[PDB]
Design a protein around this motif. Structure first.
Motif, PDB file in Angstrom:
ATOM      1  N   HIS A  25       0.936  -1.123   0.000  1.00 54.35           N
ATOM      2  CA  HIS A  25       0.000   0.000   0.000  1.00 54.35           C
ATOM      3  C   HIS A  25       0.975   1.171   0.000  1.00 54.35           C
ATOM      4  O   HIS A  25       2.047   1.076   0.614  1.00 54.35           O
ATOM      5  CB  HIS A  25      -0.861   0.054   1.269  1.00 54.35           C
ATOM      6  CG  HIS A  25      -2.342  -0.172   0.987  1.00 54.35           C
ATOM      7  ND1 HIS A  25      -2.974  -0.175  -0.191  1.00 54.35           N
ATOM      8  CD2 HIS A  25      -3.275  -0.564   1.946  1.00 54.35           C
ATOM      9  CE1 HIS A  25      -4.239  -0.544  -0.059  1.00 54.35           C
ATOM     10  NE2 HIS A  25      -4.454  -0.793   1.272  1.00 54.35           N
ATOM     11  N   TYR A  26       0.666   2.256  -0.705  1.00 49.37           N
ATOM     12  CA  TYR A  26       1.583   3.393  -0.739  1.00 49.37           C
ATOM     13  C   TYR A  26       0.854   4.687  -0.971  1.00 49.37           C
ATOM     14  O   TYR A  26      -0.340   4.693  -1.269  1.00 49.37           O
ATOM     15  CB  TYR A  26       2.617   3.218  -1.866  1.00 49.37           C
ATOM     16  CG  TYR A  26       2.010   3.278  -3.267  1.00 49.37           C
ATOM     17  CD1 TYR A  26       1.875   4.498  -3.958  1.00 49.37           C
ATOM     18  CD2 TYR A  26       1.522   2.131  -3.877  1.00 49.37           C
ATOM     19  CE1 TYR A  26       1.262   4.556  -5.198  1.00 49.37           C
ATOM     20  CE2 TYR A  26       0.911   2.175  -5.111  1.00 49.37           C
ATOM     21  CZ  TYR A  26       0.783   3.384  -5.769  1.00 49.37           C
ATOM     22  OH  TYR A  26       0.157   3.390  -6.995  1.00 49.37           O
ATOM     23  N   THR A  27       1.588   5.778  -0.819  1.00 52.79           N
ATOM     24  CA  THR A  27       1.075   7.115  -1.091  1.00 52.79           C
ATOM     25  C   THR A  27       2.293   7.885  -1.582  1.00 52.79           C
ATOM     26  O   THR A  27       3.348   7.886  -0.936  1.00 52.79           O
ATOM     27  CB  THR A  27       0.483   7.798   0.145  1.00 52.79           C
ATOM     28  OG1 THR A  27      -0.684   7.096   0.559  1.00 52.79           O
ATOM     29  CG2 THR A  27       0.094   9.235  -0.173  1.00 52.79           C
ATOM     30  N   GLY A  28       2.193   8.437  -2.783  1.00 52.09           N
ATOM     31  CA  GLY A  28       3.306   9.190  -3.328  1.00 52.09           C
ATOM     32  C   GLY A  28       3.094  10.666  -3.073  1.00 52.09           C
ATOM     33  O   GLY A  28       1.963  11.143  -3.121  1.00 52.09           O
ATOM     34  N   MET A  29       4.165  11.381  -2.772  1.00 51.57           N
ATOM     35  CA  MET A  29       4.082  12.812  -2.529  1.00 51.57           C
ATOM     36  C   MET A  29       5.270  13.483  -3.186  1.00 51.57           C
ATOM     37  O   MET A  29       6.292  12.844  -3.480  1.00 51.57           O
ATOM     38  CB  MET A  29       4.095  13.127  -1.040  1.00 51.57           C
ATOM     39  CG  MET A  29       2.834  12.717  -0.303  1.00 51.57           C
ATOM     40  SD  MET A  29       3.122  12.534   1.479  1.00 51.57           S
ATOM     41  CE  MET A  29       3.642  10.754   1.533  1.00 51.57           C
ATOM     42  N   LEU A  30       5.098  14.759  -3.500  1.00 51.18           N
ATOM     43  CA  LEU A  30       6.169  15.526  -4.113  1.00 51.18           C
ATOM     44  C   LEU A  30       6.834  16.210  -2.940  1.00 51.18           C
ATOM     45  O   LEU A  30       6.248  16.266  -1.862  1.00 51.18           O
ATOM     46  CB  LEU A  30       5.578  16.539  -5.110  1.00 51.18           C
ATOM     47  CG  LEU A  30       4.902  15.880  -6.323  1.00 51.18           C
ATOM     48  CD1 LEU A  30       3.949  16.832  -7.030  1.00 51.18           C
ATOM     49  CD2 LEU A  30       5.975  15.359  -7.274  1.00 51.18           C
ATOM     50  N   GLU A  31       8.040  16.738  -3.129  1.00 53.82           N
ATOM     51  CA  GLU A  31       8.766  17.418  -2.040  1.00 53.82           C
ATOM     52  C   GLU A  31       7.917  18.378  -1.198  1.00 53.82           C
ATOM     53  O   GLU A  31       8.225  18.618  -0.029  1.00 53.82           O
ATOM     54  CB  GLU A  31       9.961  18.206  -2.596  1.00 53.82           C
ATOM     55  CG  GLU A  31      11.039  17.352  -3.229  1.00 53.82           C
ATOM     56  CD  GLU A  31      12.293  18.135  -3.583  1.00 53.82           C
ATOM     57  OE1 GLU A  31      12.684  19.037  -2.803  1.00 53.82           O
ATOM     58  OE2 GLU A  31      12.904  17.827  -4.632  1.00 53.82           O
ATOM     59  N   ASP A  32       6.893  18.962  -1.806  1.00 54.03           N
ATOM     60  CA  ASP A  32       6.025  19.891  -1.097  1.00 54.03           C
ATOM     61  C   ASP A  32       5.048  19.212  -0.122  1.00 54.03           C
ATOM     62  O   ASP A  32       4.499  19.861   0.772  1.00 54.03           O
ATOM     63  CB  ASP A  32       5.251  20.774  -2.101  1.00 54.03           C
ATOM     64  CG  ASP A  32       4.415  19.969  -3.112  1.00 54.03           C
ATOM     65  OD1 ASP A  32       4.430  18.721  -3.086  1.00 54.03           O
ATOM     66  OD2 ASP A  32       3.739  20.603  -3.954  1.00 54.03           O
ATOM     67  N   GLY A  33       4.838  17.913  -0.287  1.00 54.38           N
ATOM     68  CA  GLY A  33       3.919  17.209   0.581  1.00 54.38           C
ATOM     69  C   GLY A  33       2.594  16.937  -0.102  1.00 54.38           C
ATOM     70  O   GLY A  33       1.671  16.369   0.483  1.00 54.38           O
ATOM     71  N   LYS A  34       2.513  17.342  -1.365  1.00 49.34           N
ATOM     72  CA  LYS A  34       1.318  17.132  -2.165  1.00 49.34           C
ATOM     73  C   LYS A  34       1.266  15.710  -2.708  1.00 49.34           C
ATOM     74  O   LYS A  34       2.253  15.185  -3.250  1.00 49.34           O
ATOM     75  CB  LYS A  34       1.252  18.153  -3.301  1.00 49.34           C
ATOM     76  CG  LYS A  34      -0.140  18.295  -3.900  1.00 49.34           C
ATOM     77  CD  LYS A  34      -0.175  19.320  -5.034  1.00 49.34           C
ATOM     78  CE  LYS A  34      -1.593  19.501  -5.564  1.00 49.34           C
ATOM     79  NZ  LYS A  34      -2.194  18.208  -6.018  1.00 49.34           N
ATOM     80  N   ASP A  37      -0.415  10.107  -5.971  1.00 46.00           N
ATOM     81  CA  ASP A  37      -0.895   8.745  -6.241  1.00 46.00           C
ATOM     82  C   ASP A  37      -1.106   8.055  -4.908  1.00 46.00           C
ATOM     83  O   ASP A  37      -0.498   8.451  -3.923  1.00 46.00           O
ATOM     84  CB  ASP A  37       0.114   7.961  -7.096  1.00 46.00           C
ATOM     85  CG  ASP A  37      -0.497   6.739  -7.751  1.00 46.00           C
ATOM     86  OD1 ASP A  37      -1.744   6.576  -7.722  1.00 46.00           O
ATOM     87  OD2 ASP A  37       0.269   5.929  -8.316  1.00 46.00           O
ATOM     88  N   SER A  38      -2.004   7.079  -4.857  1.00 48.41           N
ATOM     89  CA  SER A  38      -2.241   6.376  -3.607  1.00 48.41           C
ATOM     90  C   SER A  38      -3.154   5.163  -3.701  1.00 48.41           C
ATOM     91  O   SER A  38      -4.354   5.302  -3.927  1.00 48.41           O
ATOM     92  CB  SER A  38      -2.777   7.348  -2.564  1.00 48.41           C
ATOM     93  OG  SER A  38      -3.016   6.688  -1.339  1.00 48.41           O
ATOM     94  N   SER A  39      -2.592   3.985  -3.438  1.00 48.93           N
ATOM     95  CA  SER A  39      -3.340   2.730  -3.475  1.00 48.93           C
ATOM     96  C   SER A  39      -4.319   2.715  -2.323  1.00 48.93           C
ATOM     97  O   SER A  39      -5.294   1.961  -2.330  1.00 48.93           O
ATOM     98  CB  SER A  39      -2.393   1.542  -3.321  1.00 48.93           C
ATOM     99  OG  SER A  39      -1.654   1.677  -2.126  1.00 48.93           O
ATOM    100  N   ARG A  40      -4.043   3.540  -1.322  1.00 51.03           N
ATOM    101  CA  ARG A  40      -4.912   3.628  -0.157  1.00 51.03           C
ATOM    102  C   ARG A  40      -6.260   4.241  -0.536  1.00 51.03           C
ATOM    103  O   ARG A  40      -7.300   3.738  -0.118  1.00 51.03           O
ATOM    104  CB  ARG A  40      -4.237   4.418   0.972  1.00 51.03           C
ATOM    105  CG  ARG A  40      -2.940   3.780   1.480  1.00 51.03           C
ATOM    106  CD  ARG A  40      -2.300   4.544   2.635  1.00 51.03           C
ATOM    107  NE  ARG A  40      -1.169   3.802   3.192  1.00 51.03           N
ATOM    108  CZ  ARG A  40      -1.287   2.687   3.914  1.00 51.03           C
ATOM    109  NH1 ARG A  40      -2.493   2.181   4.177  1.00 51.03           N
ATOM    110  NH2 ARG A  40      -0.210   2.046   4.354  1.00 51.03           N
ATOM    111  N   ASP A  41      -6.240   5.289  -1.362  1.00 50.14           N
ATOM    112  CA  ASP A  41      -7.478   5.942  -1.796  1.00 50.14           C
ATOM    113  C   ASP A  41      -8.295   4.988  -2.653  1.00 50.14           C
ATOM    114  O   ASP A  41      -9.525   4.987  -2.615  1.00 50.14           O
ATOM    115  CB  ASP A  41      -7.202   7.238  -2.574  1.00 50.14           C
ATOM    116  CG  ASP A  41      -6.602   8.325  -1.704  1.00 50.14           C
ATOM    117  OD1 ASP A  41      -5.680   9.032  -2.175  1.00 50.14           O
ATOM    118  OD2 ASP A  41      -7.042   8.469  -0.544  1.00 50.14           O
ATOM    119  N   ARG A  42      -7.601   4.169  -3.430  1.00 53.27           N
ATOM    120  CA  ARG A  42      -8.282   3.204  -4.276  1.00 53.27           C
ATOM    121  C   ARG A  42      -8.690   1.980  -3.477  1.00 53.27           C
ATOM    122  O   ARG A  42      -9.399   1.112  -3.987  1.00 53.27           O
ATOM    123  CB  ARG A  42      -7.407   2.834  -5.477  1.00 53.27           C
ATOM    124  CG  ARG A  42      -7.238   3.994  -6.469  1.00 53.27           C
ATOM    125  CD  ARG A  42      -6.487   3.561  -7.711  1.00 53.27           C
ATOM    126  NE  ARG A  42      -5.059   3.401  -7.434  1.00 53.27           N
ATOM    127  CZ  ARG A  42      -4.154   4.360  -7.614  1.00 53.27           C
ATOM    128  NH1 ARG A  42      -4.505   5.555  -8.077  1.00 53.27           N
ATOM    129  NH2 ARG A  42      -2.890   4.131  -7.276  1.00 53.27           N
TER     130      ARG A  42
END
Ligand SMILES: [N+]
Length: 107
Positions: A25-34, A37-42
């Motif tokens: 399970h993952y959540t991708g973020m950009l350096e800003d914290g935004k 992508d996220s398997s958690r939301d799906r």
């Protein structure tokens, strides 16, 4: 390279090997914290075989240092993610990505 910081410990002994299917399970973020992508939301875990280059270099090297059940934060440099070109529209050029990855099991 990739930098791994434990958020919650795994069993401390079952590490993924080449050819195995990692279920995460993952959540991708950009350096800003935004988030981007996220398997958690799906609400559906993502699966990939270690070694078959079907995910970025940083995941193949970082997830290989995690053990089953472990939740970690991966900080991955451009050269280990999407390079100079990034992926226009989603990932900026020369982007350092941060992933919140939890290794659920191996298959
Ligand atoms: N890329």
């Amino acid at each position: 390279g990739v930098q791994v910081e434990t958020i919650s410990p795994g069993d401390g002994r079952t590490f993924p090997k080449r050819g195995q299917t990692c279920v995460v399970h993952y959540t991708g973020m950009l350096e800003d914290g935004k988030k981007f992508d996220s398997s958690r939301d799906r609400n559906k875990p993502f699966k990939f075989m270690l070694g078959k280059q079907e995910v970025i270099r940083g995941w193949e090297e970082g997830v290989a240092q995690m053990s089953v059940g472990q939740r970690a934060k991966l900080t991955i440099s451009p050269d280990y993610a999407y390079g100079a070109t990034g992926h226009p529209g989603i990932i900026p050029p020369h982007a350092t990505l941060v992933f919140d990855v939890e290794l659920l099991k191996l298959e």
